[PDB]
Every structure is written in C-alpha cells, then in structure tokens.
Design a protein around this ligand. Structure first.
Ligand SMILES: O=C(O)CNC(=O)C(=O)O
Ligand SMILES: [Mg+2]
Ligand code: NI
Ligand SMILES: [Zn+2]
Length: 331
C-alpha cells in the first residue's frame, strides 16, 4: 500500500506531465497521495497562471464577511457578519492597516503559534466565495475555469445526464482569516491555486480517519451536534492542532505559498488560515473514484448548510433515499 502513514505529498510535474490534468491526478493517487487528504502541486517553471496581477483592484467584493469567534482559543466557532461592499483595492488597503496586518514574526511556525494563541480576540474580514477566475484564457494547463465538469463526469461514469454547472470561486484573505473544519460538498475533490500574496496554512485529517474527527467534534460542540447530525457541513467549527494531538486525532499540516496548487481528496477534512493579504481561486471536481464517496456523503438537512443549485442533482441521483429530507432542508 503506497503512503501508509498518510503523509502530505508534494509533486513537481514537468511541463509535459502538466498537460493532462486527469492523468496527473490519477498518477498522484497511484503514489498514495489521497491517503493524506491533501497534496501540494508545484507547477513547472515554464508555466504561469496569467501575465501579471497589476490590474485586479477593481474586482468587487459584494459581501465581505467579518469572522467573529466564540469559545476558547483552541476550540471555537465563527459566525460571518456581512459588511458593506468594497473593491479588492479597498480590501487590500484594509488588510495592510495597523488593525488587520500580519504582526512581526520569525518564521511560519512562530506565526502559527500566534494564530492559535490570539485568533479569537480579533475579527478579520474575508472576501470569500466570489464567482470568477483570474486564469488567463490562453493558459491551457491547470486552468481552473477549463476543467471537465462534475456533471459530465457523472454522465460519463453512470450514464445519466443532469442539469447544473461547475464554476470557480475567488477568495481574498487577510491575516487570521479562517476556513473551518469541513469536507467538500458531496465529499468532492477540491483544487486551490494561490494566485498572489501571503501564504495559507492547512490542516488535514486522512480520509480513512475522518470519523475520528467527527466523534471529537460531537464531544466538543455538543449543542451543535444535537441540532444537526452533520453540523460540520455548516463550516463554523475550529479545533487547534494542540487539541487534536491531545485527543489522538491523526492529522498533518502544510503551508501553501503563492504559485502553488493544493488538491483536497474526497472525505479529507481540512481547515486553515491566511498569513496576510492574499488571493486564491478554487473549484470542486470529480474523478471515477469520487462516485462511491458521493453516494455515502453525509448531509445537513437542518437547514443551516444551504448550498448550490447543482448539488440537487447529485443528491437526487446518488442518494435518492435522502433526497426528499435533504430538499426539505433547502426549502
Ligand atoms: O481557501 C479557503 O478559504 C478555503 N478553501 C478550501 O476549503 C478548498 O480549496 O477546498
Ligand atoms: Mg480590476
Ligand atoms: Ni475546502
Ligand atoms: Zn445542519
């Protein structure tokens, strides 16, 4: 069995290997990369996402989100308070202000210590979930707006044609902006490209151990667990690496830098934070190996998790017994 300790693997494809996206994902899995839940892909030196980032300041962040925490430093939830619209130029200036900028630090480990010590005492503002792309249309390799769609994968594997579309999303971050513990919708893959700016630190639980994280979360968030049998789908709960180690939960960590791709694999729980002003692009995708995870994915029916139009069909075809109840949640 390849990668039996479930370590995060780092790949350096050549320009020739970068041509065929599906084939390279399958290669990485042949080496055991999926067992970690997360892999890093460093593009060949010949590749670029676009020519420059000099002209992005007029992108609008229609609904910036202030991430307000409750709890203790290592075990907390966050809620998203909606703020007034601002441009990416306005948000970058805000991120760099004395109230929100990254503190002085020695290295990524010192900054990680500072994040876990102090996160709860501040409320950073995240420009998340913005439909769009920063890849140049002429970038032919690993262009996250030109991937094969999940609807087409389902159709190719299972024969059923379904409605829905699959497009990328932009994320503009600042120091302390936080992504809560989650798997993807319908336990899909994700791919995330850090276009510019400061790093993003990730934490991940191997897919084979995901239920250990769920059991800890039910213990640590006992009211939320009674409310919803899949409350991690709400994407609000944080648990620190120190707390995970104290409870014996297997996990790994890695820091993504500008110019690097990360891939999350089906049922790989992940969480993390941004080091300072940055911009990432991400999208969900599927392979043949996803189908069995999609069939088994948990679902939130309490009404909180509220998701895309295109998840309807995935539930309806892969999980017809759950369909009715899930759809009641969404209406
Ligand atoms: O970058 C973020 O805030 C969160 N991203 C993801 O969870 C991902 O790419 O799957
Ligand atoms: Mg612009
Ligand atoms: Ni994710
Ligand atoms: Zn729920």
């Amino acid at each position: 069995a390849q990668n039996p300790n479930c370590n995060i693997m780092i790949f350096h494809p050549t320009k020739e290997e970068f041509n065929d996206f599906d084939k390279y994902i399958a290669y990485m899995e042949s080496q055991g990369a999926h067992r970690a839940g997360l892999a890093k892909i460093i593009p060949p030196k010949e590749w670029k996402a676009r020519e420059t980032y000099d002209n992005i300041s007029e992108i609008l962040i229609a609904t910036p989100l202030q991430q307000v925490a409750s709890g203790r430093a290592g075990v907390f939830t966050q809620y998203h308070k909606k703020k007034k619209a601002m441009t990416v130029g306005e948000y970058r200036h805000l991120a760099n202000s004395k109230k929100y900028q990254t503190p002085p630090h020695q290295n990524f480990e010192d900054l990680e210590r500072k994040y876990w010590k102090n996160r709860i005492y501040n409320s950073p503002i995240y420009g998340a979930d913005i439909s769009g792309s920063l890849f140049d249309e002429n970038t032919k390799q690993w262009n996250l707006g030109h991937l094969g769609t999940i609807q087409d994968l389902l159709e190719k594997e299972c024969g059923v044609v379904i409605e829905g579309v699959n497009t990328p999303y932009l994320y503009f971050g600042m120091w302390k902006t936080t992504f809560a513990w989650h798997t993807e919708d319908m336990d899909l893959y994700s791919i995330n490209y850090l276009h510019l700016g400061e790093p993003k630190t990730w934490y991940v639980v191997p897919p084979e151990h995901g239920q250990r994280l769920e059991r800890l979360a039910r213990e640590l968030f006992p009211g939320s667990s009674r409310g919803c049998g899949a409350f991690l789908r709400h994407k609000v709960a944080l648990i620190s690496p120190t707390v995970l180690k104290e409870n014996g939960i297997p996990f790994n960590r890695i820091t993504q830098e500008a110019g690097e791709f990360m891939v999350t694999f089906p049922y790989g729980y992940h969480a993390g934070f941004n080091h300072g002003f940055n911009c990432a692009e991400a999208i969900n995708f599927a392979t043949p190996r996803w189908i069995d995870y999609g069939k088994m994915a948990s679902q939130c029916s309490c009404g909180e998790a509220r998701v895309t139009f295109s998840m309807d069909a995935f539930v309806r075809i892969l999980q017809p017994e759950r369909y009715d109840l899930w759809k009641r949640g969404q209406d």
